[PDB]
Design a protein around this ligand. Sequence first.
Ligand SMILES: [Cl-]
Ligand SMILES: [Cl-]
Ligand SMILES: [Cl-]
Ligand SMILES: [Cl-]
Ligand SMILES: [Cl-]
Ligand SMILES: [Cl-]
Ligand SMILES: [Cl-]
Ligand SMILES: [Cl-]
Ligand SMILES: [Cl-]
Ligand SMILES: [Cl-]
Ligand SMILES: [Cl-]
Ligand SMILES: [Cl-]
Ligand code: NA
Ligand code: NA
Ligand code: NA
Ligand code: NA
Ligand code: NA
Ligand code: NA
Lengths: 311, 311, 311, 311, 311
Amino acid sequence: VSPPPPIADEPLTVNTGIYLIECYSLDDKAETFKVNAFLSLSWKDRRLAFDPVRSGVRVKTYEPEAIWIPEIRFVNVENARDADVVDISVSPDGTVQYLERFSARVLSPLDFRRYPFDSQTLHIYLIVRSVDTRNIVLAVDLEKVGKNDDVFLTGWDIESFTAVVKPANFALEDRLESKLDYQLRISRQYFSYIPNIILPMLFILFISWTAFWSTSYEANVTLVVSTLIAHIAFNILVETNLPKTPYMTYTGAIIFMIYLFYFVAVIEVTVQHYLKVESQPARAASITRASRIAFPVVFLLANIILAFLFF
Amino acid sequence: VSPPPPIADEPLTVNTGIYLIECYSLDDKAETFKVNAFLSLSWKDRRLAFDPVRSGVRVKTYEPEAIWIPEIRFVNVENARDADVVDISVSPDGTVQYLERFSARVLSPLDFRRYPFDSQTLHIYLIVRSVDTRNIVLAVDLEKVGKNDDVFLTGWDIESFTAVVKPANFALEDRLESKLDYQLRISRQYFSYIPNIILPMLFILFISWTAFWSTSYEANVTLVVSTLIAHIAFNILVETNLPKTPYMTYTGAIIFMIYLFYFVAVIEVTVQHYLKVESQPARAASITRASRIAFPVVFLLANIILAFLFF
Amino acid sequence: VSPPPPIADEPLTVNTGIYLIECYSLDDKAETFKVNAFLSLSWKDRRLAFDPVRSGVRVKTYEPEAIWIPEIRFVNVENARDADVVDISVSPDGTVQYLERFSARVLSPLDFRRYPFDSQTLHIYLIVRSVDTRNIVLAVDLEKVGKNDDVFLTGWDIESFTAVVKPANFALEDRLESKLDYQLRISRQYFSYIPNIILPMLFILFISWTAFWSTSYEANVTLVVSTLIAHIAFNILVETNLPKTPYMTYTGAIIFMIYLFYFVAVIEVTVQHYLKVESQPARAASITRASRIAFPVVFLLANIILAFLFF
Amino acid sequence: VSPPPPIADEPLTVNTGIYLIECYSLDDKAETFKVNAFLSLSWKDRRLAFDPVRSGVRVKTYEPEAIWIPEIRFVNVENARDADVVDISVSPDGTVQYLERFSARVLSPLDFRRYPFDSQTLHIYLIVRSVDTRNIVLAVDLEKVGKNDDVFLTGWDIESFTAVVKPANFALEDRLESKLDYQLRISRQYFSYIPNIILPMLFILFISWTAFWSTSYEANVTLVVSTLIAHIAFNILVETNLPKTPYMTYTGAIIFMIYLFYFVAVIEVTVQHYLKVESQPARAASITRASRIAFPVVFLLANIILAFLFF
Amino acid sequence: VSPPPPIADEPLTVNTGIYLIECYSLDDKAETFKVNAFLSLSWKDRRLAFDPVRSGVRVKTYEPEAIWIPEIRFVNVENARDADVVDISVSPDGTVQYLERFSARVLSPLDFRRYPFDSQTLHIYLIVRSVDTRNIVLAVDLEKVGKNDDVFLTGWDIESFTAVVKPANFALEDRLESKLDYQLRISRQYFSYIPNIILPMLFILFISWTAFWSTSYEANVTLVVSTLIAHIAFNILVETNLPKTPYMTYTGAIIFMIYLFYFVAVIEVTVQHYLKVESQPARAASITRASRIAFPVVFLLANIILAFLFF
Ligand SMILES: [Cl-]
Ligand SMILES: [Cl-]
Ligand SMILES: [Cl-]
Ligand SMILES: [Cl-]
Ligand SMILES: [Cl-]
Ligand SMILES: [Cl-]
Ligand SMILES: [Cl-]
Ligand SMILES: [Cl-]
Ligand SMILES: [Cl-]
Ligand SMILES: [Cl-]
Ligand SMILES: [Cl-]
Ligand SMILES: [Cl-]
Ligand code: NA
Ligand code: NA
Ligand code: NA
Ligand code: NA
Ligand code: NA
Ligand code: NA
């Protein structure tokens, strides 16, 4: 089977549509998400034309192997989509109406800069490579683009699923390629991060600052070192569920900055002890009294600066 | 092969029924489960009708390719079901009795609000898309709905497997779609959580309260900080086997609330030391004596409040 | 191809045999194991009978598609077995001798009550569904049931692989089903648990009891709290390689009971300090001297009670 | 297609050869390794013989379906090999030269007794089951057995890949089976274990022995208990990357023996304190001075004994 | 179908060209990476030549089964590539232009010596085995070798994708094999390692050196031992995301060397205490004052030496 011949010199327009049934496994480390959807294609193949008076049927149904079907592929998939043809219907004029249900792992880079208060635009790129005989161009039938009301992506809010109607027509290996951009806009549900990571991490930091109301070096060492170990645990936990970024993230900056506060607290606790041993507790008392105000103030200002830079 | 023609203008009723053989791999983080079951379908095709006295046989067996079979799909599956046709039998009047054995990974959302004292209603949605020639409607043959007595879902109790007999008939991309809801009711076996997470978590908390019976700041710092670290370990262990929810869970609220008790214990231990150093042990003695009663009382009341809000 | 017709009204007996080649991946958490074996089937089909004198051959080899083969399935498998037909041979009377090599992931519940000193009976259930024309019954050819001498299941001892010769004949979806039980008896190699989990866990417990020969509350707090944290690590390690059981296990009971010993040691250490501070060291000395005998005695008796209840 | 008929009563010799292209994924816990190799088979089929003078051609190429090919299988594979036929060539005498490229996950038991200073002999067992018409025997064509110079098994040194030329001919289910043993000799690259596990583990042990140069019970308790916790971490790390063995391993013995040194150090530290409190520091000084020599000496001797028993 | 016959005795040149669409999953531990690309092949088959005047067409499209296609395989792949033929086009002279889209898991070794400041040269080896009729040689059509501008390998910078134009022609099992080397040059994005592993690791080390400004053995023991435990955590974290190398890596050497600094700090802290107890604080003061300068100086010099040896 060869492609449909042109009436004049026009390219073959293949109208497309993606209808998402399910959205799952959005992997941050992998920068991949899974989709189970309907792919609908429509083109005119005048060779399939029939008279329903003779045929006895107003619409003809064909098996995929029986007729010519345009080779529509996905650009950013891991492996070739698992597809199952739902229906192929030809009307008397030769207008084929193809429908398949597919599942694919999609590659969509994520921007972790504002994590976990980030939003993402996922992409599903449809492509068609033109044949020798005639050029194939993609189109969007907006009536056949959508998503199920029950589509739930765990820990994410699905904002919109739209298509960039104008295809990206370009040359590749001396043949015309027509690309289409299906954009799924999502925003992260940041709720859980607050009682599970943020607040537990701030509590262990404030516990370390209780060493500013203690004269016991032994207990202060314990307070600041133990809480530093708990912060290393939170740092590990956070970085394990995230890919290695060549840029600084919001959570990354905060986690890092907090290490400096622990370092300076160790220095303060050390300075205080050296002075007490040197029989200068009045000077040690001045530094400790200052730290009590300085540490929360500098922490609060630094966080205002960071939130301002990122958001 | 085309669909069976209507006698008048009525839609084609496809009677259905799922019989679960196996239920396994209920992944909480993924909100998926694996099922191995029998799918039974039945419809009338008058073109397949025959006289039993003339044909000598009462039943005719066909290969799937030989006759028309309705395209029944599952809405909430990761990938298309692995199916194997068991039998296709035609009665004299033309009633086809189809049976297949399938295995599928089902996507069904879970409500972790009352975890690990939660119950779930898992869903298996059957769907059929109408053809251009005639509309297809789904039905439930209750005689062919069920589950094996040996069906065991590890760490869960299977209550019931029923079907919502009235299908959800709706339009989708200008064609009628008939949906059916098969509901598997399960309830979590909470036993193991008590000696593995709950009681160890409460013991470490009560160990921290022994600092209210000690005047040694160094030892108190150790008691409260060490037990806090052990609580962080349990918090991590619990949150790793659960998805990030946009709502507060029961275990989530308790775990969080316990961090406040540790924070206040550090404050108390600090307050007591500041007073002893300031040569005010009588006032420190009053606060420590109060804490001894206050901490268990407030803990007990807070838990009553939480259990009331969540149950 | 239809099933063999009966001479009278007798059911068709399909003689079966499983010969295990490999046994691997026994997953405790999943309650599954993988098997690679030979499945041998034998039935009489008189339509396939021949005269060896005229034919010149004492046997006839057929391709699976050429003749009727009974649809034998496994009940407790994740997905349908990966099978490859080794040979199909017909004798002059029409006795077909089928042989295939398969691999399957078998779902089989485990009893962790006596873990890690437990024994298990793994199951492989063979099933056949009767056709409308005639009923099919399963049989066991004991000469064709066995296992390779080199079959090794990592961390387990394979005791026996036998078959329950009498099939479970029952109705399912208005058709007779004949089930067969192949039982693989295995017993866990408990050796490794002793130097890796048991003895380390007892050593850390005995280290906590050295606080009964110390008057230093600070050091005692450290001894009992640190060893408690190491016990939490051993509890987590053990529970991670085991499924959540609705019953108490032997290792589970011991691990749990040990938390009580840590709790009481903290209480003792606290009591001793309160008395020393209250200028009552003679009373503290009495309690500490008692604990030195009480703790090992109660530990030894509790363990005797537990071992008795579980074995 | 039937097997080649015998000239007399001799069995059919199928000459074999495995040429390793890639060796990867040697899983210690699973006792499996993945291979990607060439399988070459050669046998004489007189029915395929021809004249090269009249046929003009020296060799005839056939598709696998066109001629009879012996069913060669692997004994110790997880699932049946992924094979792709490279070439089938027939010489004028009728000698068939088959070549396929395969990939398989091989099950081969490992001996962890001398780990991580262990060597292994991996096995690839080739097998052929005789047909009713004639018996099939395997052979090794040493000219067609080898490995690529670039074959790299991560963290292992590949010593040799040879074949045990004499097949294991035996009866199985009343038919002759001919087995061949392909042995891949490898030895573990132990380098990394020294700076990552061994030396860190010895350093933490020597840190615990600095308590023999301290009179501070509080500090000694900290030294011995903290280092014990770090040893538990290393024990967990090591045992997680190894299967549960019914025998004692070299690393297993050392790790275990080290727990005894920690236990005895706690006892010494406790004994020293009890004496100092009892106003007997001279006796405590004698024991502490003895321990300083005893602990390294007994450690050094115990290790000599262990290395002797294991090597 | 047989290969194209030679005009003289020349080998058949198959021009090749890989165009990368996607690069993902670079696993360091596994030394693998996944690729999704276009494979283009071109060869002259005179049997397929035609006159464009008589035929009425300038290009003839064929199905893969219709004509002879050279068996091109990848050397370093886990399993055989997942391929889908895009187009096969024949010009009047008989020049075939083949195009397929494939996906493969490629096994390419990595050099961790300079990790995480390392660069790698990934390899894709194309191979062809000569047939008995004629020899096949590979070539590179540089016009058809490239990569998409959007090709992103997470945590890596893609420098270039080129091909070694001269094939590696060699004998294998008495047949000519022609190998081609496609080299993908990448360099690691080291940014994230600095705030996540390097700086936290240096901070904990500097915290341990505050024991040189303290006379409290108890607090010093705590400072040096706790920070040592945090270093063990960072060593474990680093080594888990890396394979076991038979050579020393840059990060490996630093991590190891740091253990020596902790060991010597314990020795210093111990020496200081022994002297203070022996009523020699003046000598202890000299050693502690020396350590304050020695430790940072030796650390800085050792690091200069290491960076020099590795870069
Ligand atoms: Cl398509
Ligand atoms: Cl695709
Ligand atoms: Cl169907
Ligand atoms: Cl489906
Ligand atoms: Cl079968
Ligand atoms: Cl099956
Ligand atoms: Cl084969
Ligand atoms: Cl195989
Ligand atoms: Cl190809
Ligand atoms: Cl390939
Ligand atoms: Cl050569
Ligand atoms: Cl050649
Ligand atoms: Na087609
Ligand atoms: Na059909
Ligand atoms: Na059949
Ligand atoms: Na064949
Ligand atoms: Na071909
Ligand atoms: Na301490």
